[PDB]
Design a binder for these strands. Structure first.
Lengths: 49, 46
RNA sequence: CCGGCGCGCG
DNA sequence: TCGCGTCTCTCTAAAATTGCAGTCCCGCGCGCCGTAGGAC
DNA sequence: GTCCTAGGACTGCAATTTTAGAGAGACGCGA
């Protein structure tokens, strides 16, 4: 409603995906860290991408 | 409310009495914009 | 030299 | 002489369940049992 | 004896199964 031509869709998709990636990695890392499992952020970022 | 049926056809004559009935029974025989203005959106983004 | 059923090992 | 809610369906827009489709660690060993049915 | 012999568990999703929304042609009653 604020931005029309693709800045409406491009910025909206960019903001949604950027927030989703941060929380998706955080939730998975929190689950594994709670059990002492040590996995690099690179491996999870490969899956989340 | 049979006069509402007349809107489905061209309304030939009709009006007084029994003409609407005969016609409804014989009608079955035939069957400001700112698009492309990147500067405005850049201003709105901030 | 094909598949089912049962019992096991890591 | 028509007019009025309206009798009797009537046809479809919009959810509300509901019956499938799909899937459900890996790698080894051993044994048993099939292959059935019927008029001669 | 046998010789040929013919009933989990969860998710996904389109498919009913209504519920509903309006709605109209002919109408029995009525102005």
């Amino acid at each position: 409603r604020i931005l029309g031509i693709p800045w409406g869709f491009l910025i909206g998709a960019e903001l949604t995906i950027v927030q989703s990636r941060i929380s998706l990695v955080n939730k998975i890392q929190k689950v594994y860290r709670s059990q002492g499992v040590q996995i690099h952020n690179r491996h999870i970022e490969i899956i989340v991408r | 409310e049979l006069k509402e049926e007349l809107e489905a056809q061209g309304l030939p004559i009709d009006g007084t009495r029994n003409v609407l009935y005969q016609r409804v029974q014989k009608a079955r025989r035939i069957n400001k914009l700112h698009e492309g203005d990147t500067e405005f959106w850049k201003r709105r983004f901030l």
